[PDB]
């Protein structure tokens, strides 16, 4: 259903989470995972994409 929704099929992999640790344990929609994978960007625990740099 995800690939049907967003029109992306060529994902090498889609690394998930072993288990929701949030209180609600509400899962992210898969489409966003597909788009992350398609561009190869990683996620952090809130759903935002971060980038450490010595300031």
């Amino acid at each position: 259903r995800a690939m049907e929704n967003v029109k992306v099929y060529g994902v090498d992999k889609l690394k998930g989470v072993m288990g929701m640790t949030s209180g609600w344990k509400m899962p992210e929609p898969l489409e966003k995972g597909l788009l992350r994978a398609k561009n190869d960007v990683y996620v952090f625990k809130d759903g935002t994409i971060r980038f450490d740099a010595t300031d």
């Binding site: 690939m3 029109k7 099929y9 060529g10 994902v11 090498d12 398609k38």
Partner: protein, 246 residues
């Protein structure tokens, strides 16, 4: 609602693999003229241009013209399951499936749900290509595999009646010269000095699947993309377009 019959399924699976190692999905512009493919890598660094004239097929039955949308990975595993001489068939009727029939010693039928492909058409006709060379397959294949040792960017140098490749890393140095006098260099068309550099990874994706009996065309200019080409059963040839570096 077409049907198609191609012999030597292993060959066709090989070339579909070739297209496969760069893109993950793609659409097939089937016309009554023939089967066509055209797509670009995710990185926007290479352009795969597949051209299949209907003549190559032992049978070619198209009723109209339509675009297929298929998972190159799934099709790659499927076609890869064919062998040396078993016959390939491609059928499509009303439903949204593609039927692949491998019939050698026996018949085997597969079905592939077609997938919508957002088409980004970028047609890039002839461009200013300073030098143009033909060369045996295993020559370039060996060469790329050699440049894999010392670096990740292979540099090409085309001089008058002489074609030379090279690459340099931290310490080691790799050079491959050859001219018309040499056996593997079938042709050279030198307009003037040409030089470029290309991603050795992408080249490795390109030249894999080339026997010694494989002739390859290479057009390119000073600091600009290469265009590689090679024929398939002498009618339908494939053409890659690789952007240089730096």
């Amino acid at each position: 609602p077409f049907e198609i019959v191609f012999e030597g399924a292993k060959e066709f699976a090989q070339l579909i693999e070739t297209a496969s190692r760069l893109i993950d999905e793609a659409a097939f512009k089937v016309t009554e003229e023939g089967i066509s493919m055209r797509a670009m890598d995710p990185s926007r660094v290479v352009l795969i241009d597949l051209n299949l004239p209907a003549s190559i097929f032992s049978k070619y039955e198209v009723d109209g013209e339509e675009t297929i949308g298929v998972n190159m990975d799934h099709l790659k595993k499927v076609l890869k399951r064919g062998k040396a001489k078993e016959t390939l068939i491609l059928r499509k009727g009303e439903e949204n499936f593609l039927e692949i029939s491998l019939q050698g010693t026996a018949t085997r039928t597969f079905k592939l749900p077609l997938i919508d492909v957002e088409e980004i058409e970028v047609d890039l006709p002839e461009l200013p290509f300073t030098a143009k060379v033909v060369i045996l397959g295993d020559v370039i294949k060996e060469a790329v595999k050699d440049a894999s040792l010392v670096s990740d960017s292979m540099k090409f140098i085309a001089k008058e009646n002489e074609f030379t490749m090279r690459a340099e890393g931290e310490t080691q140095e790799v050079e491959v010269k050859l001219t018309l006098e040499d056996e593997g260099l079938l042709d050279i068309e030198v307009q003037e000095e040409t030089k470029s550099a290309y991603g050795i990874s992408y080249l490795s994706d390109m030249v894999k699947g080339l026997g010694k009996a494989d002739e390859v065309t290479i057009k390119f200019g000073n600091e600009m993309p290469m265009q590689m080409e090679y024929y398939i059963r002498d009618e339908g040839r494939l053409i890659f377009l690789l952007a240089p570096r730096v």
